[PDB]
């Protein structure tokens, strides 16, 4: 039960990546985004 | 090189797997990370 409002720097195309993709799943927010992310990274 | 900053409220969990990525692959900074993993979204 913890967060961090972190601050990260993505390029163009990734940020225009990552809100089509958030948009396209119907994503609460990038966050949602990242927690899919982070779980495809983890394993 | 000039990209976007963002920022995002992630989970305490997500962030430290992030960051056990970043390690993994030598990664410069936590964006380097989540680029690959916006990346691996759209492939």
């Known amino acids: 039960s ?3 409002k972190l601050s990260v720097s993505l390029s163009d195309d990734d940020v225009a990546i990552l809100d089509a993709y ?3 799943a119907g994503l609460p927010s990038r966050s ?3 927690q899919h992310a982070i ?3 983890r394993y």
Chains 1, 2 share one sequence.
Request: aromatic share 0%; charged share 25%.
């Open 39 to 41: 779980r495809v990274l």
């Open 32 to 34: 949602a985004g990242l």
């Open 2 to 4: 913890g967060s961090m």
């Open 22 to 24: 958030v948009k396209r």
